[PDB]
Amino acid sequence: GVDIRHNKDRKVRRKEPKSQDIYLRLLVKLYRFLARRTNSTFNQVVLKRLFMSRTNRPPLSLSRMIRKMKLPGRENKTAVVVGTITDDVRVQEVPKLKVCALRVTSRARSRILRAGGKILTFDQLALDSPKGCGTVLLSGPRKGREVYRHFGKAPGTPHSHTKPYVRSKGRKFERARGRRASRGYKN
């Protein structure tokens, strides 16, 4: 007998996409080959992002992409997002952008192409830069979801600002006792 513990032997991680999308599986084959046969850690990151789930691949807005590509030294670089580019109607001027994405919204695609931009799929990205040279790897806001407002410490604990689960929002729904000093306590 050996004095070891077996509760952490199996590492919980994605080894393949849970999706059955055949196009996604083909480009997973492509990036599996590239990550194996190249030393580019960019290919490894892209492969593990392809394995990920939809909540772990949040959409990237056009405004955030523009803001991140506007940073100094990122001129003439390819913006790579493993996910969906989303049009942002809050931005007025769209610069010329060369972007690779898994999906592009129709309106965002129209705006990018009208601004003189270029849109690439991931196979085209592999052909253009197999090692991922000259790329800006971007991600959408991972915690930009409604569930993360409920996650955290319990609402009925001091110094917690986590949203409770209420069927309705109003003055009658969870506002009296434990929410103001006039009714028992507040914390």
Binding site: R171, K172, R177, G178, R179, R183, N187
Partner: protein
């Protein structure tokens, strides 16, 4: 699909996943939200603070239509007209400013979140916020009220 559920895997195990000691009984603890102040008080206080008691003034015969007042922000303000409108106004030689009728678009109040592009515009709304009016005046526009 019933073939994908735990019941198909729990065949042959006597307790069906509910334990031999505590078992699966009818209603231990009560039915529904029973004992929210007595023996489920910790759960209720921990996850639903404010649940018990009255706060505020009650109002009989509430009509939602009376208080109906949708809002639009200045950052989404220019999305209410066509792209042709904005480009024509921007490249216009004369200082003519387009009119945006948020009541026509389905909004009653204009709120001031965001910023506007540097070009004048007339905005027709039922209500304006102070910062929305200030930001519209900043770009050389005007705020006009409707009923």
């Amino acid at each position: 699909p019933s073939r994908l559920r735990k019941t198909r895997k729990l065949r042959g195990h006597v307790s069906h996943g509910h334990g031999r000691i505590g078992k699966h009984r009818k209603h231990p603890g009560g039915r529904g939200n029973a004992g929210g102040l007595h023996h489920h008080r910790i759960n209720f206080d921990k996850y639903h603070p404010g649940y018990f008691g009255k706060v505020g003034m009650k109002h009989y015969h509430l009509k939602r239509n009376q208080s109906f007042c949708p809002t639009v922000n200045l950052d989404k303000l220019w999305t209410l007209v066509s792209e042709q409108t904005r480009v024509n106004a921007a490249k216009n030689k004369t200082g003519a400013a387009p009119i945006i009728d948020v009541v026509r678009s389905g909004y009653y109040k204009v709120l001031g979140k965001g910023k506007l592009p540097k070009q004048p515009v007339i905005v027709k709304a039922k209500f304006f916020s102070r910062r929305a009016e200030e930001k519209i005046k900043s770009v050389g526009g005007a705020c006009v009220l409707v009923a």
